[PDB]
Amino acid sequence: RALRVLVNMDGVLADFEGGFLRKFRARFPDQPFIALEDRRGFWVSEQYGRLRPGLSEKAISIWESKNFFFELEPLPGAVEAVKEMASLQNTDVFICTSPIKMFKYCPYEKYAWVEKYFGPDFLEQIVLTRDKTVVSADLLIDDRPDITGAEPTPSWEHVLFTACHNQHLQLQPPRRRLHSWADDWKAILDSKRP
């Protein structure tokens, strides 16, 4: 009866792309980089790997470093929108996020980041998983174009959240975008209500 919305973290709430680029440039000032306007494809590591030898591994070392996830800046409007969204009648919001393979810091920092921006009580709303298809909900707002896993027919509608890496993608027509948190996310939610 309540509408359930899964909201992705990196690329939707947290600015992974901008934080990575800043830290990559600071740590490797003599390496080439990829300006955000030039990002293409979900995987940062793959494009850097295509840019020059051994750059995939250097990219990876940025997000494997302590404080990388914790120090990500929220995206504009994200904290305000999700707070408003959660307070809406008949609306349950979960933050659904995938950790990286190296688990020393990432899960911890993601919990810490949510506490910081949404408060202790919002920690109950976090779902950490590598497979989003096994989480059920009416909506998934997520910047990754290809969301697959163990469940061939997920219950959610995936709404693509715009990011530098996906902004040029033509979606297969039924599919829909949320262009930024300034875009009309209430209209999207309302279209799913009974």
Ligand X SMILES: O=c1[nH]c(=O)n([C@H]2C[C@H](O)[C@@H](COP(=O)(O)O)O2)cc1/C=C/Br
Q: Which residues bind Mg ion (CB under 5 A)?
A: 8, 10-11, 91, 143
Which residues from 64-103 bind a second copy, rule CB under 8 A? 92, 94, 99, 101, 103
Cα(98)–Cα(128) distance, rounded to whole angstroms? 6
User: Which of 155, 162, 167, 180 is close enough to bind a second copy by CB under 8 A?
Assistant: 155
Binding of residue 43 to ligand X (CB under 6 A): yes
Which residues from 55-94 bind ligand X, rule CB under 6 A? 60
The string of DSSP codes covering 26-92 is HH-TTS----GGG--SS-HHHHHHHHSTTHHHHHHHHHTSTTTTTTPPBPTTHHHHHHHHHHSTTEE
Dihedral (C-alpha) 52, 53, 56, 62: value to the nearest 10 degrees?
-80
| Nearest distance in Å: CB 111, ligand X | 13
Nearest to ligand X of 149, 191 (CB atom): 149
User: Which of 55, 72, 82, 126 is close enough to bind a second copy by CB under 8 A?
Assistant: 126
CB atoms within 10 A of CB 38: 11
User: Which of 5, 7, 10, 156 is close enough to bind ligand X by CB under 6 A?
Assistant: 10
